[PDB]
PDB file of C-alpha atoms and ligand atoms in Angstrom:
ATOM      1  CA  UNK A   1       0.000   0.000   0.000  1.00  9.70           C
ATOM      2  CA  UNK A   2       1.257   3.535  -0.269  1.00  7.97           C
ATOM      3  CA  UNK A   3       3.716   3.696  -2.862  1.00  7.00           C
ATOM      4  CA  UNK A   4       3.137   0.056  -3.234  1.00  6.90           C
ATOM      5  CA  UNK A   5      -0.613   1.393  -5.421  1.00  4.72           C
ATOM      6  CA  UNK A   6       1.499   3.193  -8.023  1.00  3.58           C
ATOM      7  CA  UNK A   7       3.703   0.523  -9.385  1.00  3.56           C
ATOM      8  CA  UNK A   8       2.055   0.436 -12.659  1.00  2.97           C
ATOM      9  CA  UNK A   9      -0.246   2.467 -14.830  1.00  2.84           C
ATOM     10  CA  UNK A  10      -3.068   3.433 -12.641  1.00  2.39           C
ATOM     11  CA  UNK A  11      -6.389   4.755 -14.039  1.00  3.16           C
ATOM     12  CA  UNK A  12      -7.069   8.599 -13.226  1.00  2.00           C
ATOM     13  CA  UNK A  13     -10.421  10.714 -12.815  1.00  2.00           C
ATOM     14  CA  UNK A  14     -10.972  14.328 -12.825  1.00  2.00           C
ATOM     15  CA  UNK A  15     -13.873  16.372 -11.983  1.00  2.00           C
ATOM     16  CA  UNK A  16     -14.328  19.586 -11.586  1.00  2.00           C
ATOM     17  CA  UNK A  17     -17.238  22.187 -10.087  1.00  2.00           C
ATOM     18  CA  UNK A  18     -16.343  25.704 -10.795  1.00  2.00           C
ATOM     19  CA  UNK A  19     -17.673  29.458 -10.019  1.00  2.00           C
ATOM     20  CA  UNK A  20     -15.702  32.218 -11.290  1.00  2.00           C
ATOM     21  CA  UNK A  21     -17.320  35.676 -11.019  1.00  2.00           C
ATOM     22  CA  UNK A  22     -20.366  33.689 -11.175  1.00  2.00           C
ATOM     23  CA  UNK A  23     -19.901  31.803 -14.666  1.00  2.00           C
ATOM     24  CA  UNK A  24     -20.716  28.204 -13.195  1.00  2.00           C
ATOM     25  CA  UNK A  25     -18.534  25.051 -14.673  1.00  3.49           C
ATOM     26  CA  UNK A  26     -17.914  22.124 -15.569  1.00  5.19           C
ATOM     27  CA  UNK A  27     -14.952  20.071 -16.512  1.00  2.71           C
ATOM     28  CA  UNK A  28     -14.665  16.483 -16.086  1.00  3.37           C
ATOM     29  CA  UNK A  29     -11.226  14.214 -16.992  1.00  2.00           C
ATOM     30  CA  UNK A  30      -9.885  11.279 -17.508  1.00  2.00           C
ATOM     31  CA  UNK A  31      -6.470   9.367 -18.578  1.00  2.00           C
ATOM     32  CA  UNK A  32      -4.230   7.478 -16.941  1.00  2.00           C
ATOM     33  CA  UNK A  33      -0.686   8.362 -14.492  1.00  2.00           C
ATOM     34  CA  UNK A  34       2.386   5.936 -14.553  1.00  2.00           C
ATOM     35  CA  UNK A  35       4.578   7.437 -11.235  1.00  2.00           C
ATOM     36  CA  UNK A  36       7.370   4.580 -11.868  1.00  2.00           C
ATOM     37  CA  UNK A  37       8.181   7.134 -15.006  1.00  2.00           C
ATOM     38  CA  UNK A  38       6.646  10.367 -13.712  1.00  2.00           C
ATOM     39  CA  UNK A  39       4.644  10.246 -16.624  1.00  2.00           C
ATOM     40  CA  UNK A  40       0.908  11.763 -17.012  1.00  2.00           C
ATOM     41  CA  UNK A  41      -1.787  11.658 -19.954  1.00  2.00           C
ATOM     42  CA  UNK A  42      -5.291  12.946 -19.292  1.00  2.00           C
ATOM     43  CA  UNK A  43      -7.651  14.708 -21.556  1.00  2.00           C
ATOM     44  CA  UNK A  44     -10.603  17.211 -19.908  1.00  2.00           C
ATOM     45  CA  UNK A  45     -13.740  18.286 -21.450  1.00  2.00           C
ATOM     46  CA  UNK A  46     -16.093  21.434 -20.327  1.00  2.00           C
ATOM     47  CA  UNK A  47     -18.946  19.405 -19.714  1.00  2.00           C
ATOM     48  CA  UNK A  48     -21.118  22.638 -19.217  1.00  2.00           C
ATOM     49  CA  UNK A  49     -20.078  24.103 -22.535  1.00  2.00           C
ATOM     50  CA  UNK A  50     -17.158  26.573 -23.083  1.00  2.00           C
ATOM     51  CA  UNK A  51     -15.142  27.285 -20.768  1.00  2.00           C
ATOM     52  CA  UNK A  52     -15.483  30.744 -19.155  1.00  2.00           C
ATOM     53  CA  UNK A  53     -11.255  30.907 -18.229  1.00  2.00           C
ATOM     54  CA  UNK A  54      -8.279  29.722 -20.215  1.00  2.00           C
ATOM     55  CA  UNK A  55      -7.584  26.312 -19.900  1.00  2.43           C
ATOM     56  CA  UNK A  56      -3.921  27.307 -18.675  1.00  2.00           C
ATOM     57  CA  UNK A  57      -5.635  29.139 -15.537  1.00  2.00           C
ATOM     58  CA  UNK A  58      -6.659  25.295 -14.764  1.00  2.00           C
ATOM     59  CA  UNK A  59      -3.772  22.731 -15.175  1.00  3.91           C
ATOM     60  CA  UNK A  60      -2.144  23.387 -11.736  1.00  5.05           C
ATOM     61  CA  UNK A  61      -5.951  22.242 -10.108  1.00  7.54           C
ATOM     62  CA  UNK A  62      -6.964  19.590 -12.098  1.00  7.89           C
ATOM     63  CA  UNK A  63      -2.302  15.024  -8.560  1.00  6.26           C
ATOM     64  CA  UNK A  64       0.946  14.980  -7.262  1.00  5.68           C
ATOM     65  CA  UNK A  65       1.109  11.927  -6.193  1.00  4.12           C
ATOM     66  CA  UNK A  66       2.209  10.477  -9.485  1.00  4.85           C
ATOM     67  CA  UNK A  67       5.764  11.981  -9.301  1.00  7.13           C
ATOM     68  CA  UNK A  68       8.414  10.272  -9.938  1.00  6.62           C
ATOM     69  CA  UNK A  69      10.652   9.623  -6.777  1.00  8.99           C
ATOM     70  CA  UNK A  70      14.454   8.223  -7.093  1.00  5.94           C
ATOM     71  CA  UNK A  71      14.489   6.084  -4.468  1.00  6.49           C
ATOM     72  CA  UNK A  72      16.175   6.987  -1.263  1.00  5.64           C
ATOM     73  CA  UNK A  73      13.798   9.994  -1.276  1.00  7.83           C
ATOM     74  CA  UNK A  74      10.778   7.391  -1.386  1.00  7.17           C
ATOM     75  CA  UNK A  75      10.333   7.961   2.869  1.00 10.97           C
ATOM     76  CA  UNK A  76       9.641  11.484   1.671  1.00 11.09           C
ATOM     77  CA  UNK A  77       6.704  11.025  -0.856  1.00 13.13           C
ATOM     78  CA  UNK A  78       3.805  12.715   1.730  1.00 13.00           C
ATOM     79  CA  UNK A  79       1.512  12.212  -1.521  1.00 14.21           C
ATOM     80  CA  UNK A  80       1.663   8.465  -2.103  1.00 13.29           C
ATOM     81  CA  UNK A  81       2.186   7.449   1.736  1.00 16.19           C
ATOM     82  CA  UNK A  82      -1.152   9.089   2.512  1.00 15.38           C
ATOM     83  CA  UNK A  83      -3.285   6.392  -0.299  1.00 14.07           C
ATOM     84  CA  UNK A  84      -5.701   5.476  -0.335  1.00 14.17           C
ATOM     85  CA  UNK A  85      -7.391   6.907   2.151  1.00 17.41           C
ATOM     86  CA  UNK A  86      -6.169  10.328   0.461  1.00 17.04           C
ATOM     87  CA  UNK A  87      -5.221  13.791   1.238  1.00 19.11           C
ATOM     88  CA  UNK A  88      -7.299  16.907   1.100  1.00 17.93           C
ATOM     89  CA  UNK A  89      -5.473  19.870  -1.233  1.00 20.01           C
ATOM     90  CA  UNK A  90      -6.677  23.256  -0.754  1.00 18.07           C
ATOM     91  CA  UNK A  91      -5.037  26.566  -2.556  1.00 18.22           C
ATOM     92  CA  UNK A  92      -4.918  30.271  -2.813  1.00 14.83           C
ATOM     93  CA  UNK A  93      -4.301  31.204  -6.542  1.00 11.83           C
ATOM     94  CA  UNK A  94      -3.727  34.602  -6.746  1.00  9.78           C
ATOM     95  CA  UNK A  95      -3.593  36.622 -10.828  1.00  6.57           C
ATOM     96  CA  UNK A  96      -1.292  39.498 -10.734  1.00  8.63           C
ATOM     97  CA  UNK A  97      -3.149  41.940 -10.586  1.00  9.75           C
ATOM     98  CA  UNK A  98      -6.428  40.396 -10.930  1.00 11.08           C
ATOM     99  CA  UNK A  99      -8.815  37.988  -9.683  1.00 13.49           C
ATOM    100  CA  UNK A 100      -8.004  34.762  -6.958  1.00 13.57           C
ATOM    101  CA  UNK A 101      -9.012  31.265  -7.757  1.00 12.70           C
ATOM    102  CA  UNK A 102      -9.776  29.574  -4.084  1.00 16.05           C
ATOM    103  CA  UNK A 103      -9.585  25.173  -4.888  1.00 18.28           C
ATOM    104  CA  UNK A 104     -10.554  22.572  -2.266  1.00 19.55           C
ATOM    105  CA  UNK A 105      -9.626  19.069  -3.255  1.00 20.43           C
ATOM    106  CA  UNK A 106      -9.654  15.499  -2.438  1.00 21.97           C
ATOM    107  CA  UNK A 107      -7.528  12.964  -4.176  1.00 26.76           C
ATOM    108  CA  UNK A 108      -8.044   9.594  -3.158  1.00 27.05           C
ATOM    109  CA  UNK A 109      -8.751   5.658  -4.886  1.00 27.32           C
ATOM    110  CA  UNK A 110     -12.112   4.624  -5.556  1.00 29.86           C
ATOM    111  CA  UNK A 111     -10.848   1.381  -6.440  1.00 29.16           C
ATOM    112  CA  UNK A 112      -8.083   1.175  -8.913  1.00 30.88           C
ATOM    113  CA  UNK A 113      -8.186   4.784  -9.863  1.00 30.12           C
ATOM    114  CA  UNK A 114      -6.884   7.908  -8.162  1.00 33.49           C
ATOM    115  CA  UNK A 115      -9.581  10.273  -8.339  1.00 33.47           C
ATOM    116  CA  UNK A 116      -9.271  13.992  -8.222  1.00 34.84           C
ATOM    117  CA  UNK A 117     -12.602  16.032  -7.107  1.00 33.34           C
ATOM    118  CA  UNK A 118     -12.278  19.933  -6.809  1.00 31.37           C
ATOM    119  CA  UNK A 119     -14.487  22.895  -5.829  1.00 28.69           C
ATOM    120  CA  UNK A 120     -13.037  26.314  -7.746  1.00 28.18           C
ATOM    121  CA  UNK A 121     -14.333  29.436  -6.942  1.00 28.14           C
ATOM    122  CA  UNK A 122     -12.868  32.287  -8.479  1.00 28.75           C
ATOM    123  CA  UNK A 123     -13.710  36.140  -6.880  1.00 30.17           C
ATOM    124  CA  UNK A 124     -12.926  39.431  -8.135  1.00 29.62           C
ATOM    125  CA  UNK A 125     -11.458  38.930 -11.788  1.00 32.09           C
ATOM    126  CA  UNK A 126     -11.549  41.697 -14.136  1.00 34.78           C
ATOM    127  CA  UNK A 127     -13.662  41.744 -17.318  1.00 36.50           C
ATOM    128  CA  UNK A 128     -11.093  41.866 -19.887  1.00 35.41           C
ATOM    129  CA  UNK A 129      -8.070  40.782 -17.922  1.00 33.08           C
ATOM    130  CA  UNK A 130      -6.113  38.052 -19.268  1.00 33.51           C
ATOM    131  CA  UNK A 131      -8.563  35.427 -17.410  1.00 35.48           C
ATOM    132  CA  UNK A 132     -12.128  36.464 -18.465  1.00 32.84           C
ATOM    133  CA  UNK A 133     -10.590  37.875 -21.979  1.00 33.68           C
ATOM    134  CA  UNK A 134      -8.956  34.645 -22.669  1.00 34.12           C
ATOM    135  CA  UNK A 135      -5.500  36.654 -23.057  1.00 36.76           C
ATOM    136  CA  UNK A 136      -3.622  33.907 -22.335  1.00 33.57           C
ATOM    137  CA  UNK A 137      -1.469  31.130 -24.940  1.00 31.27           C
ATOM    138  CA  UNK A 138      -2.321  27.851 -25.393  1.00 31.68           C
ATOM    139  CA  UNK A 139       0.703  26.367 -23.433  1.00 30.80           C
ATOM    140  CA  UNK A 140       2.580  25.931 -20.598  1.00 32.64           C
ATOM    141  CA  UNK A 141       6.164  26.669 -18.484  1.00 34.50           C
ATOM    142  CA  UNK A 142       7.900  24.384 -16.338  1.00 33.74           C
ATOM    143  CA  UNK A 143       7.966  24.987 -12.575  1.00 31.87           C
ATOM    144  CA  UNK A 144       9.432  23.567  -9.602  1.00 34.04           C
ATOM    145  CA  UNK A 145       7.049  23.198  -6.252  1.00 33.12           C
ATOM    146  CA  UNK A 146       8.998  23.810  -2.891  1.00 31.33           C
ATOM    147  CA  UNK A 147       7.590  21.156  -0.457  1.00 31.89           C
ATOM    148  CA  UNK A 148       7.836  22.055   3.133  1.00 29.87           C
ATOM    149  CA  UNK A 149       6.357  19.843   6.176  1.00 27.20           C
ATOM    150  CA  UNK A 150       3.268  21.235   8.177  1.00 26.24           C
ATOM    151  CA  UNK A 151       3.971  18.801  11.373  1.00 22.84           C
ATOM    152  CA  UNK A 152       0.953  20.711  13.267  1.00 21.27           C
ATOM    153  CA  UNK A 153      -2.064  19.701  10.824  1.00 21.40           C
ATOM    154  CA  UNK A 154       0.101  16.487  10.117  1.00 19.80           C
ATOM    155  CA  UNK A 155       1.088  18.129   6.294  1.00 19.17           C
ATOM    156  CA  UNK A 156       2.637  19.807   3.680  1.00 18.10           C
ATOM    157  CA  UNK A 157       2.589  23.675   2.105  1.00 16.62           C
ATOM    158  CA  UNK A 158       3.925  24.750  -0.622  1.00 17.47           C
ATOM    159  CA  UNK A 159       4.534  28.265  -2.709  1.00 13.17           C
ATOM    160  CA  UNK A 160       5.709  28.731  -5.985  1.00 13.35           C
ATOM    161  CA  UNK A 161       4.812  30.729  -9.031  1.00 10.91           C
ATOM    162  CA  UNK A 162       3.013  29.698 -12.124  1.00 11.11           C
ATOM    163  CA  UNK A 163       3.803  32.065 -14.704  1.00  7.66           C
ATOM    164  CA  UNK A 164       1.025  32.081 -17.941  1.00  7.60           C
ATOM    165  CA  UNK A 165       2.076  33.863 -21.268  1.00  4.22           C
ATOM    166  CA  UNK A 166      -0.084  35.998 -22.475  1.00  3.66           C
ATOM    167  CA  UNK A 167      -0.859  36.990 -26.371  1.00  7.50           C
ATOM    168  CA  UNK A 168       1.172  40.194 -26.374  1.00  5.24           C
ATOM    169  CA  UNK A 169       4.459  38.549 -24.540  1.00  4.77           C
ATOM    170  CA  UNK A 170       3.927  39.525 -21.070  1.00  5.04           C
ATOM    171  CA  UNK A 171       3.561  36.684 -18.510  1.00  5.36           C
ATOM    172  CA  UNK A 172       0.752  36.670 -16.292  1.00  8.85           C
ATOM    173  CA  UNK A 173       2.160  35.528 -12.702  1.00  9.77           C
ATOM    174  CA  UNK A 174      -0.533  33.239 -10.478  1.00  9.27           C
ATOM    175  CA  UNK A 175       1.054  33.007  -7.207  1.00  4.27           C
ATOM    176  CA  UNK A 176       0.228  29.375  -5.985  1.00  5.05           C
ATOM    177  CA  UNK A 177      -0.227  28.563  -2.010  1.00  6.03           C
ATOM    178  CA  UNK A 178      -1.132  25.575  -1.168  1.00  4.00           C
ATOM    179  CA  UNK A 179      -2.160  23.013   1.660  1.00  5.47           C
ATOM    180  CA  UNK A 180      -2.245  19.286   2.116  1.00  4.36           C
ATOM    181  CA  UNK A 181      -3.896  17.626   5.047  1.00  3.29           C
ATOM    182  CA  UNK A 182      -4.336  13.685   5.131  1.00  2.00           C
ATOM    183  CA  UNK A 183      -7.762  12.414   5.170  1.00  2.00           C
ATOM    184  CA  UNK A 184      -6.932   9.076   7.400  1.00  2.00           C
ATOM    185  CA  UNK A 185      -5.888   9.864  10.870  1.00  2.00           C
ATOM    186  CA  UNK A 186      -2.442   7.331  10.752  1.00  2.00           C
ATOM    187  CA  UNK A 187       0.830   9.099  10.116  1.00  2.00           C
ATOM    188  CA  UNK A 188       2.686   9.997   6.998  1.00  2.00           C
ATOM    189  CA  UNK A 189       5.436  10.669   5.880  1.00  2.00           C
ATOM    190  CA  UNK A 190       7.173  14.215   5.788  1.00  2.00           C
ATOM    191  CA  UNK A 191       9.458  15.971   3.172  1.00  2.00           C
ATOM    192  CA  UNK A 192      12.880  17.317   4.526  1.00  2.00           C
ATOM    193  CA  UNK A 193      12.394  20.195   1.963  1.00  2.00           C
ATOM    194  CA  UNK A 194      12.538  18.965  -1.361  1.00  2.00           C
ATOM    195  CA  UNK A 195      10.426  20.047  -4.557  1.00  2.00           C
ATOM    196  CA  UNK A 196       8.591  18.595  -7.206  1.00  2.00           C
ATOM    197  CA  UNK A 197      10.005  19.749 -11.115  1.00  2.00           C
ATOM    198  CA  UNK A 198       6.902  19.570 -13.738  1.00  2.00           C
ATOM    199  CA  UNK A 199       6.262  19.968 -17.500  1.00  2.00           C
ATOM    200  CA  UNK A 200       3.550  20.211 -19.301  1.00  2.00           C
ATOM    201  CA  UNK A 201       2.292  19.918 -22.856  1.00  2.00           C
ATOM    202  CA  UNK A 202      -1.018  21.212 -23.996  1.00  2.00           C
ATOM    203  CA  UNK A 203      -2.503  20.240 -27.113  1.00  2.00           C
ATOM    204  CA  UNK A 204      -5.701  19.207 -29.062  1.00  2.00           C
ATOM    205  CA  UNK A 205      -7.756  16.048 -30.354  1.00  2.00           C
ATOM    206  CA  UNK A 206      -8.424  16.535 -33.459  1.00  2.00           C
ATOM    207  CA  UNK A 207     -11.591  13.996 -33.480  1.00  2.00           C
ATOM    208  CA  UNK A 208     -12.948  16.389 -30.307  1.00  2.00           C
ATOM    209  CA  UNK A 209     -15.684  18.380 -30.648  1.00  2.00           C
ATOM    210  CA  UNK A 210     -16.003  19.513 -27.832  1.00  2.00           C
ATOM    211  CA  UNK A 211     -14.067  22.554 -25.361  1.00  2.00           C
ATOM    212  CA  UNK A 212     -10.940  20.487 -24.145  1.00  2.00           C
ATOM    213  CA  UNK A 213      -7.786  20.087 -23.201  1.00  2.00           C
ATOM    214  CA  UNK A 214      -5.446  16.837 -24.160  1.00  2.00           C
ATOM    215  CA  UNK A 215      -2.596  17.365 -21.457  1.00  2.00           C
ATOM    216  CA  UNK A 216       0.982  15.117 -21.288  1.00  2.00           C
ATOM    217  CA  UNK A 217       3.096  16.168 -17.861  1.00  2.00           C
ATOM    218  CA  UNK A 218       6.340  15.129 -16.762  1.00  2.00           C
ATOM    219  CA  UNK A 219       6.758  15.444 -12.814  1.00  2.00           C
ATOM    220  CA  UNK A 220       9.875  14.437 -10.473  1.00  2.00           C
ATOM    221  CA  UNK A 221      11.066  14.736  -6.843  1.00  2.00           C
ATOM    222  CA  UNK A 222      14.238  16.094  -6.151  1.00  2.00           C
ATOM    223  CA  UNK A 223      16.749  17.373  -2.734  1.00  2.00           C
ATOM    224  CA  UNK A 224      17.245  20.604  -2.737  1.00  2.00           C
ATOM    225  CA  UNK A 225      21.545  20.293  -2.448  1.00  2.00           C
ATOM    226  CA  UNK A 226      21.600  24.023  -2.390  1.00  2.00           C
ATOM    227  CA  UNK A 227      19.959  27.302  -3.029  1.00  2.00           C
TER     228      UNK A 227
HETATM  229 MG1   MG B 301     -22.614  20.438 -14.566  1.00  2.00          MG
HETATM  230 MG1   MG B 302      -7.707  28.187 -23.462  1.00  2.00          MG
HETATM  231 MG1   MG B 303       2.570  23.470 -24.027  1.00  2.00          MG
HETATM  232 MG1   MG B 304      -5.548  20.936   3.394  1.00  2.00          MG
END
């Protein structure tokens, strides 16, 4: 158990419930993670419609515990130890100078597959920012995730900085905080400040009709030897 439920290719769902400035959402997902290779393939669809944000604005929320770990950092992984009961994942997103996505999670099994369910609600964006005037490219950066322990709620936190291009070349900065909490009451284990490295790939099925998003990520776990 633990890291013992990622060996192979486990199944992966996504759903989504989201409010921002009152456009109501949909967005439900589904693919598959392989943590052995830190390897990631899900596709989402706007169940509701079209989306009212940028698909970008929504990678980081739509499940960290398929990184890949090399293996005397293993005792480390909070993520996997915490399965299958789960761990709750809350964050503050906060647009440079615009509005603030607020995400509760919980990513757990139901069975063989790791489910992710989130609640976004998004408060005070600005009409034709680069959220609500879909300013923002069709890709993604790379980013590294600075894991720090949270021994009082039994956790982790984390900051870092997603930074979104935008149409004209600027780079629209959404300032990440985040919270994990286990949802079982045993203990788990705790990072000795490490951080996660990601990339991402955005693209499109071409057989899709639908509003989507066909997303590959790499993620991996690594000591910080220095700043
Ligand atoms: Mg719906
Ligand atoms: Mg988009
Ligand atoms: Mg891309
Ligand atoms: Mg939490």
């Amino acid at each position: 158990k633990g890291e013992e439920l990622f060996t192979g290719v486990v199944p992966i769902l996504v759903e989504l419930d989201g409010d921002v400035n009152g456009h109501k959402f949909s967005v439900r997902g589904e693919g598959e993670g392989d943590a052995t290779n830190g390897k990631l393939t899900l596709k989402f669809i706007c169940t509701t419609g079209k989306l009212p944000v940028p698909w970008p604005t929504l990678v980081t929320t739509l499940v960290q515990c398929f990184s890949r770990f090399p293996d005397h950092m293993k005792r480390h992984d909070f993520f996997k130890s915490a399965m299958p009961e789960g761990y709750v994942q809350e964050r503050t997103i906060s647009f440079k100078d615009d509005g603030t996505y607020k995400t509760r999670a919980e990513v757990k099994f139901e069975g063989d597959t790791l489910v992710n369910r989130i609640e976004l609600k998004g408060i005070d964006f600005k009409e034709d920012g680069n959220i609500l005037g879909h300013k923002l490219e069709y890709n993604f950066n790379s980013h590294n995730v600075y894991i720090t322990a949270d021994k009082q709620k039994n956790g982790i936190k984390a900051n870092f900085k997603i930074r979104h291009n935008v149409e004209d070349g600027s780079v629209q900065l959404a300032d990440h905080y985040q919270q994990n909490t286990p949802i079982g009451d045993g203990p788990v284990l705790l990072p000795d400040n490490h951080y996660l490295s990601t990339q991402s790939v955005l693209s499109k099925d071409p057989n899709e009709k639908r509003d989507h998003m066909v997303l590959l990520e790499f993620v991996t776990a690594a000591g910080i030897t220095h700043g």
